[PDB]
Amino acid sequence: AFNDLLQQVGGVGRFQQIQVTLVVLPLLLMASHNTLQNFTAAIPTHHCRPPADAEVWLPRDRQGQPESCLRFTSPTEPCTDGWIYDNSTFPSTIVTEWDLVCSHRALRQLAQSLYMVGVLLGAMVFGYLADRLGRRKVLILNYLQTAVSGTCAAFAPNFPIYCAFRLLSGMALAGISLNCMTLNVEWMPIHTRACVGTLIGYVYSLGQFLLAGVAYAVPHWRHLQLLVSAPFFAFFIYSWFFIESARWHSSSGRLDLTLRALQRVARINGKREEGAKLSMEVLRASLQKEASAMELLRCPTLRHLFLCLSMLWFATSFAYYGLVMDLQGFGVSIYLIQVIFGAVDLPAKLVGFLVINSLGRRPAQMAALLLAGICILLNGVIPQDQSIVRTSLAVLGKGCLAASFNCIFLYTGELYPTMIRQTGMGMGSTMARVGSIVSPLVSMTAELYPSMPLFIYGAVPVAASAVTVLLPETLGQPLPDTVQDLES
């Protein structure tokens, strides 16, 4: 009877209206910390540096641009000296610092892959530790670790040091991304739980505008990293004023902490008269009524559904985190491309929400996945000469993939049974990062063909679109109470 206690205290009060906002506010930096390898590691035009022995020194070809590989040893040798980088729009990037051009092109993808690997470990470890040490302590440690491991990456003189710092930053960001939702969902009542779930996605979607504005404000990559990682100290400094969740305290076994927290919340809300009436015996009278991960195995009913949902999550995450990167080559400047990409998610979600409830869950998911797959696959045949339909197809695919996540989140949440739902959500979110890790590894194959990664990015959603026809439709149907009554 925790719900009746929340309604007795006041439910949605001033304390919630302060705490949920002060917790969701730092999430605006998700886009800045995630999709940074478009601005901080841009590749400008470059050519070989001639030796200091002196225009006609380079083997220019393909309509006369200088060749960055050969150098005309006689007035056919590798460079091994250095390069001259343009400084008209990119004064300093990663490839400018350590000369990561023409011989070490894959190390950018390697650093991105390491940052993506550093997400699963952080999510697993800190999600395991949060249910043992408490949400507020883990949030405090995350706030500290993010700033400490982010502000030192701008002064890294070597590449592996920067990679390790970015991996630890990805650890901290994965931890905070899980723990913000975990702490925010608990305090809200049963009838307003779904309202705050969509609100956090709105905050995540708004980060691209801030990222574009900050990137336009400072071109220099060290100052960019410092300015992005700076506000985490100011976020950490007031983090000691949060109140621990009463549900975790009650499930732990200590009820005096729940009584003290409820009384304190009554003082903040101004309803201390109900808090005085609230005592120990009513918690022992109303909360008297207050599943392994391997149960998916050796049970075909759960395993058959789990395999398909994991495949869908993997395919959607792979397509999204492959499309969002490599913004260069579109002709339009990346600053405009960022805001145009950020301005497409809202109408796509608006269309998708009505499409789900007007047609069906599975038909909407199939339509979104098939449309995204064919739209990405169409991009691989039209040449470089055009400059409008490429951007149109890219933004349509990005918005449609965002709608695909918006559909599959509610589909996965509603489809699973009640008891196994939490670990199903956790395993689905875990599987939704393997594709993100793999996407730089398959993007590394751009050397062989200039459109093979683009062909790969379109084939997986197309293949997974026809996979969805193997699931029952659960629109306007009761949720499965257990496995015994799960037949349709």
C-alpha positions in Angstrom: 0.0 0.0 0.0 2.8 2.4 -0.9 0.6 4.1 -3.4 -2.0 5.0 -0.7 0.8 6.3 1.5 2.0 8.5 -1.4 -1.5 9.8 -1.9 -1.9 10.4 1.8 1.4 12.4 1.9 0.2 14.4 -1.1 1.5 12.5 -4.2 2.9 14.9 -6.7 4.1 17.8 -4.4 6.6 20.6 -4.5 9.4 18.1 -3.4 8.8 16.1 -6.6 8.6 19.2 -8.8 12.0 20.2 -7.5 13.8 16.8 -7.4 12.7 15.4 -10.8 13.7 18.6 -12.6 17.0 18.9 -10.7 17.7 15.3 -11.6 16.7 15.4 -15.3 18.5 18.8 -15.9 22.1 17.3 -16.2 20.8 14.9 -19.0 21.0 17.7 -21.6 24.7 16.8 -22.0 23.9 13.3 -23.2 24.1 14.3 -26.9 27.2 16.5 -26.3 29.1 13.6 -24.6 27.8 10.9 -27.0 28.0 12.5 -30.5 31.2 14.5 -30.1 33.3 12.7 -32.7 31.8 14.8 -35.5 33.1 18.2 -34.2 36.1 17.3 -31.9 37.6 14.9 -34.4 36.7 16.4 -37.8 39.0 15.6 -40.8 39.8 18.7 -42.9 41.5 18.7 -46.3 45.2 18.0 -46.2 48.2 17.4 -48.4 51.8 16.3 -48.1 54.3 18.8 -46.7 57.0 19.6 -49.3 60.6 19.4 -48.1 62.4 22.7 -47.3 64.6 22.6 -50.4 62.8 25.0 -52.7 53.8 24.5 -56.6 54.5 21.5 -58.9 55.6 19.0 -56.3 52.5 16.7 -55.7 50.8 14.1 -58.0 47.4 15.9 -58.2 44.6 13.8 -59.8 40.8 13.4 -59.8 40.1 16.9 -61.1 43.3 18.4 -59.7 43.2 18.1 -55.9 46.7 17.2 -54.4 47.4 13.6 -53.5 48.0 13.0 -49.8 49.9 9.8 -50.3 52.8 10.3 -52.8 55.3 13.1 -52.9 57.4 12.9 -56.2 60.8 11.8 -54.7 62.5 13.0 -57.8 62.0 16.5 -59.4 57.1 7.8 -55.5 58.0 7.6 -51.8 56.0 7.7 -48.5 55.7 11.0 -46.7 57.1 10.1 -43.2 57.6 13.8 -42.5 54.3 15.6 -41.9 51.3 17.2 -43.4 49.9 20.7 -43.9 46.3 21.0 -42.6 43.8 23.7 -43.6 42.9 26.2 -40.9 40.0 28.1 -42.4 37.2 26.2 -40.6 38.9 23.6 -38.4 41.8 25.3 -36.5 42.7 22.2 -34.5 41.3 18.6 -34.3 42.5 15.2 -33.3 43.9 14.3 -36.7 45.8 17.7 -36.7 47.5 16.9 -33.3 48.9 13.4 -33.7 48.8 13.2 -37.6 46.1 10.6 -37.8 45.7 10.8 -41.6 46.6 8.5 -44.5 48.1 5.8 -42.3 46.0 5.5 -39.1 42.5 6.3 -40.3 41.0 3.5 -38.3 42.1 4.8 -34.9 39.2 7.3 -34.7 36.9 4.3 -35.1 39.0 2.5 -32.5 38.6 5.3 -30.0 34.8 5.4 -30.7 34.6 1.7 -30.3 36.5 1.9 -26.9 34.1 4.6 -25.8 31.2 2.3 -26.7 32.8 -0.7 -25.0 33.1 1.4 -21.8 29.3 1.7 -21.7 28.3 -1.9 -21.1 30.8 -2.4 -18.2 29.8 0.7 -16.5 26.1 0.0 -16.9 26.4 -3.6 -15.6 28.7 -2.8 -12.6 26.9 0.3 -11.4 23.5 -1.1 -11.9 24.5 -4.1 -9.8 26.0 -1.8 -7.1 23.1 0.7 -7.0 20.7 -1.9 -5.5 23.3 -2.6 -2.8 24.6 0.9 -1.9 21.7 3.2 -2.8 20.7 5.4 -5.6 21.9 8.7 -4.2 25.4 7.5 -3.3 25.8 6.0 -6.8 24.6 9.3 -8.3 27.1 11.3 -6.2 29.9 9.0 -7.3 28.8 9.3 -10.9 28.7 13.1 -10.7 32.2 13.1 -9.2 33.7 10.6 -11.6 32.3 12.2 -14.7 33.9 15.6 -14.0 37.2 14.1 -12.7 37.6 11.8 -15.7 36.4 14.4 -18.2 38.3 17.5 -17.3 41.7 15.7 -17.5 41.1 14.3 -21.0 41.6 17.8 -22.6 45.2 17.8 -21.3 46.1 14.3 -22.4 49.4 14.4 -24.4 49.1 10.8 -25.8 46.4 8.8 -27.5 45.9 5.8 -25.2 45.6 8.1 -22.2 42.8 10.0 -24.0 41.1 6.7 -25.0 41.2 5.4 -21.4 39.8 8.7 -20.1 37.0 8.5 -22.7 36.3 4.9 -21.6 36.0 6.0 -18.0 33.8 8.9 -19.1 31.6 6.4 -21.0 31.4 4.3 -17.8 30.2 7.4 -15.8 27.7 8.4 -18.5 26.3 4.9 -18.7 25.9 4.8 -14.9 24.2 8.2 -14.7 21.9 7.3 -17.7 20.7 4.2 -16.0 20.5 5.7 -12.5 18.6 8.9 -13.4 15.8 6.8 -14.8 16.0 4.3 -11.9 15.7 7.0 -9.2 13.1 9.1 -11.1 10.7 6.3 -11.9 10.4 5.2 -8.2 9.0 8.2 -6.4 6.3 9.1 -8.9 2.8 7.5 -8.3 1.3 4.6 -10.2 -0.9 6.9 -12.3 1.9 9.3 -13.4 4.7 6.8 -14.1 4.2 7.0 -17.9 4.1 10.8 -17.9 7.7 11.2 -16.8 9.1 8.4 -19.0 8.5 10.4 -22.2 9.7 13.7 -20.6 13.3 12.4 -20.2 13.4 11.5 -23.9 12.4 15.1 -24.7 15.4 16.3 -22.6 17.7 13.9 -24.5 16.4 15.1 -27.8 17.0 18.8 -26.9 20.8 18.2 -26.3 21.7 18.4 -30.0 20.8 22.1 -30.3 23.0 22.9 -27.3 25.8 20.7 -28.8 25.6 22.6 -32.1 25.6 26.0 -30.3 28.6 25.1 -28.1 30.5 23.7 -31.1 29.8 26.9 -33.1 30.9 29.0 -30.1 34.3 27.3 -29.7 36.0 25.5 -32.6 39.0 24.4 -30.5 38.7 20.8 -29.4 40.5 21.1 -26.0 38.3 24.0 -25.0 35.3 22.2 -26.3 36.0 19.2 -24.1 36.7 21.4 -21.1 33.5 23.4 -21.5 31.4 20.3 -22.0 32.9 18.5 -18.9 33.0 21.6 -16.7 29.3 21.8 -15.5 29.5 18.3 -13.9 31.4 19.8 -10.9 28.6 22.3 -10.4 26.1 19.5 -10.7 28.0 17.4 -8.1 28.4 20.2 -5.6 24.7 20.3 -4.7 24.1 16.6 -5.1 24.2 15.9 -1.3 20.8 17.4 -0.8 18.8 14.6 -2.4 16.6 12.2 -0.4 17.0 8.4 -0.8 14.2 6.4 -2.2 11.8 5.0 0.3 10.9 1.9 -1.8 14.6 0.7 -1.7 14.7 1.3 2.1 11.5 -0.6 2.6 12.5 -3.5 0.4 15.9 -3.6 2.2 14.3 -4.3 5.6 14.9 -1.0 7.5 11.5 0.6 8.1 12.7 3.4 10.5 14.5 5.0 7.5 11.2 4.8 5.5 9.4 6.5 8.4 12.0 9.3 8.7 12.0 9.9 5.0 8.2 9.9 4.7 8.0 12.3 7.7 10.7 14.6 6.1 8.8 14.6 2.8 5.7 15.5 4.8 7.5 18.5 6.3 8.7 19.6 2.8 5.2 19.2 1.3 3.6 20.9 4.2 1.4 17.9 5.2 2.9 17.1 8.6 -0.5 16.3 10.1 -0.7 13.1 8.1 2.9 12.4 9.0 2.1 12.6 12.7 -0.7 10.1 12.2 1.7 7.8 10.2 3.5 5.5 12.6 5.2 2.1 12.7 2.1 -0.1 13.1 0.3 1.3 10.0 3.4 0.4 7.9 3.4 -3.1 9.4 -0.4 -3.1 8.7 -0.5 -1.8 5.1 2.9 -3.0 3.7 2.5 -6.6 5.0 2.2 -7.8 1.4 5.4 -6.0 0.3 12.9 -15.0 -11.4 16.5 -15.9 -12.2 18.3 -14.5 -15.3 18.8 -18.1 -16.5 15.0 -18.8 -16.6 15.0 -17.5 -20.2 17.1 -20.6 -21.0 15.6 -24.1 -20.8 12.2 -22.4 -21.4 11.3 -22.2 -25.1 8.3 -19.8 -24.6 10.5 -17.0 -23.1 13.6 -17.9 -25.2 11.7 -17.6 -28.6 10.5 -14.1 -27.7 13.8 -13.0 -26.2 15.8 -13.9 -29.3 13.5 -11.9 -31.6 13.4 -8.9 -29.3 17.2 -9.0 -28.8 17.6 -9.1 -32.6 15.3 -6.1 -33.1 17.1 -4.1 -30.4 20.5 -5.0 -31.9 19.4 -4.1 -35.5 17.8 -0.8 -34.5 20.7 0.3 -32.3 23.2 -0.6 -35.1 21.3 1.3 -37.7 20.9 4.4 -35.5 24.4 4.6 -34.2 25.8 4.0 -37.6 23.8 6.7 -39.4 24.3 9.4 -36.8 28.1 9.5 -37.3 30.2 10.4 -40.4 28.3 13.6 -41.1 31.0 14.8 -43.4 30.6 14.5 -47.1 27.0 15.7 -47.3 28.0 19.1 -48.8 26.1 21.1 -46.3 28.1 22.2 -43.2 27.8 19.9 -40.2 26.6 22.7 -38.0 23.3 23.0 -40.0 23.2 19.2 -40.4 23.2 18.8 -36.6 20.2 21.1 -36.0 18.3 19.6 -39.0 18.9 16.1 -37.5 17.7 17.3 -34.1 14.6 19.0 -35.6 13.2 15.8 -37.2 12.5 13.5 -34.1 9.4 15.4 -32.9 7.2 15.1 -36.1 8.4 11.5 -36.5 7.3 10.6 -33.0 4.0 12.5 -33.5 3.3 10.4 -36.6 4.5 7.2 -35.0 2.4 7.5 -31.8 -0.8 7.7 -33.9 0.4 5.0 -36.3 0.9 2.5 -33.4 -2.6 3.0 -31.9 -4.4 3.4 -35.3 -2.9 0.3 -37.1 -1.1 -1.9 -34.5 2.1 -2.4 -32.6 3.7 -4.9 -35.0 2.5 -3.3 -38.2 3.9 0.1 -37.0 7.2 -1.5 -36.0 7.4 -3.3 -39.4 6.5 -0.2 -41.4 9.1 1.9 -39.5 11.9 -0.7 -39.8 11.2 -1.4 -43.5 11.0 2.3 -44.4 14.2 3.1 -42.6 16.0 0.1 -44.2 14.9 1.0 -47.8 15.6 4.7 -47.2 19.2 3.9 -46.0 19.7 1.4 -48.8 18.6 3.9 -51.5 21.4 6.2 -50.4 24.1 3.8 -51.7 23.4 4.1 -55.4 23.0 7.8 -56.1 26.3 9.6 -56.7 27.9 12.6 -55.0 26.6 15.1 -57.5 23.3 15.6 -55.7 23.1 17.6 -52.5 19.4 17.7 -51.4 17.9 14.3 -51.6 20.8 12.8 -49.7 20.1 15.0 -46.7 16.4 14.4 -47.0 16.9 10.6 -46.9 19.3 10.9 -44.0 16.9 13.0 -41.9 14.0 10.7 -42.8 16.0 7.7 -41.8 17.1 9.3 -38.5 13.6 10.4 -37.6 12.1 7.0 -38.5 14.8 5.2 -36.5 13.9 7.4 -33.5 10.3 6.5 -34.0 11.4 2.9 -34.1 13.0 3.2 -30.7 9.9 4.9 -29.4 7.8 2.0 -30.6 10.1 -0.8 -29.5 10.5 0.6 -26.0 6.8 0.4 -25.2 6.5 -2.9 -27.1 9.2 -4.5 -25.1 7.9 -3.0 -21.8 4.3 -4.2 -22.4 5.1 -7.6 -24.1 7.1 -9.3 -21.3 5.3 -10.9 -18.3 5.2 -9.1 -14.9 7.8 -10.8 -12.8 10.5 -11.1 -15.5 9.9 -7.7 -16.9 12.8 -5.9 -15.1 15.5 -8.3 -16.1 14.0 -8.5 -19.6 14.3 -4.7 -19.9 17.8 -4.9 -18.6 18.9 -7.6 -21.0 17.3 -5.7 -23.9 19.1 -2.5 -23.0 22.3 -4.6 -22.7 21.8 -6.0 -26.2 21.0 -2.5 -27.5 24.7 -1.5 -27.2 26.5 -4.4 -29.0 25.4 -2.9 -32.4 26.7 0.5 -31.2 30.1 -1.1 -30.4 30.2 -3.0 -33.7 29.2 0.0 -35.9 32.7 1.6 -35.9 34.3 -1.8 -36.6 32.2 -2.3 -39.7 32.6 1.4 -40.6 36.4 0.6 -40.7 35.8 -1.2 -44.0 35.5 2.0 -46.0 38.9 1.5 -47.5 38.0 -1.4 -49.7 34.8 0.2 -51.1 33.4 3.7 -50.7 29.8 2.5 -50.2 30.2 -1.0 -48.6 29.5 0.3 -45.1 26.5 2.1 -46.5 25.2 -1.1 -48.0 25.8 -2.9 -44.7 23.9 -0.3 -42.8 20.8 -0.8 -44.9 20.7 -4.6 -45.2 20.3 -5.3 -41.5 17.1 -3.3 -40.9 15.6 -4.7 -44.2 16.3 -8.2 -43.0 15.0 -7.6 -39.5 11.8 -6.0 -40.9 10.5 -9.4 -42.0 11.4 -11.0 -38.7 8.6 -9.2 -36.8 5.9 -11.3 -38.3 6.7 -14.1 -35.9 5.2 -12.4 -32.8 1.6 -12.3 -31.6 -0.3 -9.0 -31.6 -1.0 -7.5 -28.1 -3.1 -4.4 -28.9 -6.2 -4.1 -26.7 -5.3 -7.3 -24.8 -4.6 -7.9 -21.2 -1.0 -8.2 -20.1 0.3 -11.8 -19.3 -0.1 -12.4 -15.6 2.4 -15.3 -15.7 3.9 -17.9 -18.1 1.1 -20.5 -17.4 -1.6 -18.3 -18.9 0.6 -16.9 -21.8 -1.1 -18.5 -24.9 -2.1 -15.3 -26.8 
